[model samples]
Target: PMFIVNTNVPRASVPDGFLSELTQQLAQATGKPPQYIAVHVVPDQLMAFGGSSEPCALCSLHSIGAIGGAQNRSYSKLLCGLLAERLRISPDRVYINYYDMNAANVGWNNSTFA
Candidate 1:
């Protein structure tokens, strides 16, 4: 399984040294190791939220397991809190797209997880 964090927050909003800790936090939230976590920060994005020009983000979380009602509920709280705490972005302004994957379609190195 893989955890990918796609955010639209300004890349420089957080200091350059923050990425590692943020990635580790994501890994902890998703029950994965830092090694398997992939983060893509697309800062300075052309995005608006609730009609204001405040900071915003969209995260696509793809994983092979630990995805469901209770787990997602937990993740929502944890991730949203993380975003708000570190990026000053409100939870209401953030969006997460969850993709449940199978080994046949997920790949690593030069082959699929299957």
Candidate 2:
């Protein structure tokens, strides 16, 4: 699984260990092992939301069969809270997109997961 984050907050202001923390939380949420989760955070981005640029964030979680259904509410709650606490970004300023993937569609090392 892959978790990607883009935030307007400066990279220097991003808390250390945020990715590890995110990985752990996502692992718990998705019932996936921490070793299998990949986290990427890109801070200091130029972004705007609702006609303003007030520390907004865009995030996406890509995984194989771990998202969707009524469970997104729970994931959203957890992720928003984490981002708010770690990145100082308001929950309302964050957008998290979930993608359920197929193993055969992704490639790693020298071959596809298929």
Candidate 3:
């Protein structure tokens, strides 16, 4: 699984341990082992939402499974809460896109999961 975070917040301003915290959360949320999860944070992005930038964030989660339907609500709650607490981004200003990808499309070790 991988998480991509894009935010208008500057990278330097992001708190220490933020990456580990997010990775741990992703592991818990997806029930995936920590080693299998990857996190990429792209801060200082030029982004605007709801007609304002205002420290908003857009995040995407890609996983082979553990995403869809009611499961998203729980992930949203935890992820949004973390963003709000750490980055001061309001839940209303954060959007998380979940991608439940197929194993055959993911590549590893010179081969796809298929």
Candidate 4:
């Protein structure tokens, strides 16, 4: 599974070591094993947003059997709050994309998990 965090903001736009915090929080929020979760932090990424200097971030959460109707709804609230609290990104500017995958689509060890 992956918790990919990318921000057009600079390394200093948020805070020091924001990626590390994001990794742990995603693991806790998703109830996924920490070892299986990965995070990517992009700084000074040159992304075009609504075109504002206001703090903003984008997150992608992906895994098999990790999303649902109620679950996905709660995830949006919780993850968005995390961004507002930890990263100080405006709640309005944080967008989270979630992926519900199939076992055959994911690989681990020497083969696919399926």
Ranking, TM-score, top scorer first: 3, 2, 1, 4
Give me the runs in candidate 2 sitting further than 4 Å from their true place.
none
* Tens-digit lDDT track of model 4 for 1-114: 787777766676666766677778778878887888887777676565588767777778888887988888888887788777866777789778889989999988989979
**Cα error of candidate 4 at position 56, Å:** 1.9
Query: Is candidate 1 or 2 superior in TM-score?
Result: 2
lDDT of each: 0.74, 0.90, 0.91, 0.78
Query: Which residue pairs in model 2 clash with each other?
Result: none
Clashes of 4: 0
Off by over 4 Å in 1: 1-8
Over the full model, what C-alpha lDDT does candidate 4 score relative to the true structure?
Answer: 0.78
TM-scores of the candidates are 0.84, 0.95, 0.95, 0.82
**Collision pairs in model 4:** none
Residue 57 in candidate 4, Cα distance off native in Å: 1.9
TM-score winner: 3
- Candidate 4: misplaced stretches above 4 Å? none
Tell me how far the alpha carbon of residue 4 in candidate 4 is from the true structure, in angstroms, after superposition.
Answer: 0.8
